[PDB]
Structures are given as structure tokens and as C-alpha cells.
Amino acid sequence: GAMDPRTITMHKDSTGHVGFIFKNGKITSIVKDSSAARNGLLTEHNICEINGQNVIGLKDSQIADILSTSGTVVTITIMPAF
Numbered sequence: 559g560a561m562d563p564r565t566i567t568m569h570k571d572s573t574g575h576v577g578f579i580f581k582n583g584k585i586t587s588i589v590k591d592s593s594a595a596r597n598g599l600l601t602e603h604n605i606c607e608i609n610g611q612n613v614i615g616l617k618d619s620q621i622a623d624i625l626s627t628s629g630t631v632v633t634i635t636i637m638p639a640f
């Protein structure tokens with residue numbers, strides 16, 4: 559149902575970005591026309607896995623560094639959170 563996970567595969571743009579903001583593991587904004595926008599990354603969902611790597615229990619700075627250092631393809635598993 560509503561709590562099935564979603565896998566969102568994005569491609570960094572020419573500036574190195576997939577197009578989102580997050581805080582405390584939770585997506586908070588999507589950049590217009592970005593890969594995040596076009597592949598359905600959602601706010602009010604938490605980041606669980608990036609490129610197959612479990613990121614549950616990691617700090618935002620750790621998530622950030624995984625995102626920045628990734629190759630162009632960035633795949634995120636997201637779940638609703640409360």
C-alpha cells in the first residue's frame with residue numbers, strides 16, 4: 559500500500575546535481591526540471607539506501623558526502639516517515 563518503498567534513479571546534471579534538498583534524512587525540496595523532479599523523488603520521505611548502500615542511521619553529512627562523491631547515476635530508496 560502507501561508504505562511500499564520507492565526506488566528513484568536519477569542522473570546528475572552538467573553541474574553535478576540531481577536536484578534536491580534534505581534535512582535529518584528527509585527530503586525537503588525538489589529542484590524544478592531536475593532529475594529528481596522528473597523521476598519522482600518525493601518530499602516527506604526518508605532516505606534509506608543510496609546506490610545499494612544502507613544509509614539508515616548515518617548523519618546528514620555522511621549522506622551528503624555519499625551523494626556528492628557518487629558517479630552520475632544516483633539511486634535512492636525512499637519511504638514515508640512520521
Ligand SMILES: [Cl-]
Nearest residue numbers: 559560561562
Ligand atoms: Cl495503505
